[PDB]
Amino acid sequence: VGWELEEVLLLDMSLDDGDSKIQNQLKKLQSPIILLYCTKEEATYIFEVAN
């Protein structure tokens, strides 16, 4: 099966006031499908940044 994996972006939210730092990393996504793996409340932070 012909797959194509682009990014394995590793996020981090223990940094203080790191919202800017996590913003640049997430912009480097140009794929139709994203396989997100995080925690329920961590997803809200990620989705809001994506929002």
Add this chain to the structure above:
Amino acid sequence: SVGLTGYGYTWIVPSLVAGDTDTVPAEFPTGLISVSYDEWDYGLPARVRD
């Protein structure tokens, strides 16, 4: 916010958006290219004479 300002992206802009070249709204990307009327070289006294 999307990511089309730096890296290999240069924006070319008319003199309308540049406007007052003395004030930069701090939201224009660095390396912005604009075409503007020649005010620095030839001043007002030349314009009135012309």
